[PDB]
Symmetry: D2
Subunit: 106 residues, 4 copies
């Protein structure tokens, strides 16, 4: 089958960044969202430069909009997790100066 998800919440901590043996960047963070009618924490993952952009521009307590797919993996005493497709900061209660980086294809 398939599964996509969109989440709006606040960062719990700041995006922790780490690089892979291959060189590929992997940001990491967890979005906490409390619906109105609670408390749900979703840990997300991002790759490639978008990983570095996140770690570089976001901080704990930031309101974000996330679209991605679900994922699970085993831990030792399976938990759901989110594969980020694209992430941005909400302008619902904030503003932001945006600086794109040019080089379209790659």
């Amino acid at each position: 089958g398939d599964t996509t998800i969109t989440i709006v919440g606040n960062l719990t901590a700041d995006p922790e960044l780490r690089f892979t043996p291959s060189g590929a960047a992997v940001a990491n963070f967890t979005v906490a969202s409390t619906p109105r009618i609670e408390a749900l924490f979703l840990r997300c993952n991002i790759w490639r430069e978008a990983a570095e952009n996140v770690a570089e521009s976001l901080t704990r307590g930031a309101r974000v909009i996330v679209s991605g797919r679900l994922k699970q993996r085993s831990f030792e005493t399976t938990v759901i997790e989110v594969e980020v497709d694209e992430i941005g900061p909400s302008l619902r209660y904030a503003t932001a100066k945006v600086n794109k980086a040019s080089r379209s294809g790659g």
Copy 2:
């Protein structure tokens, strides 16, 4: 504040389950098995995830009556952290009309 809605397409892995609450409310439980297709390289179709869902009210019974193990369903809902344990609070569920057909009933008789 920020919410979290989700749409899932997968299979049931078992017949639903009618868990009547102590208060007297119907609740159907099932888990949607979904393994996505990943157009890469040429594995091109793998990484199965199992999502535990909880449908409430009237639909808890329509689901327990209509759906069965191996069923391809389309689920709409939200992720709740109540109850490890994040589950899908199903808002709408329906037998996918892909690969299958169905005869629909209604609201008002028998």
Copy 3:
């Protein structure tokens, strides 16, 4: 970019079916959904056997759940339309007898 959508509503008319010169089946119908806090009509499209399944099993006034992508096309005096990924009938106010068809790969 990209865009996915999920709709829950009722059929306005019955799925109209038609075949293509290539032989590919194309069902067609439009879902009317009125949110609670209105009246929005979305015309959908489906292909392959799922098209025939729809026309064969659904009827006007039926509550359905639809996931797909948006699409637009010009008409003469552009309108948004939905490319159905998968459609099923809601069990929120109904029940259904399901008869899968076997032949997994194709």
Copy 4:
């Protein structure tokens, strides 16, 4: 009854627009241009669609201030048929952190 929510990723095509209502409410208007990728055959990336969106309240101004033509945004919302004409009633919007970076402000000063 049945609702309809949607998530869009695309570009703005122009700077937003502050359309203050007669009542006195802020409203920002823009249209998200989105052309999806379609892994088929080997066109493998085409069919551009343009979605007109309307963001309201406080965010109408934060958007008009923060975003500009050519911007890659992530939009969350619902399709409304008010005003041909189906538009996106934006609930949340944000500059996509893919291909770009951003400096976030907040709620309470200056």
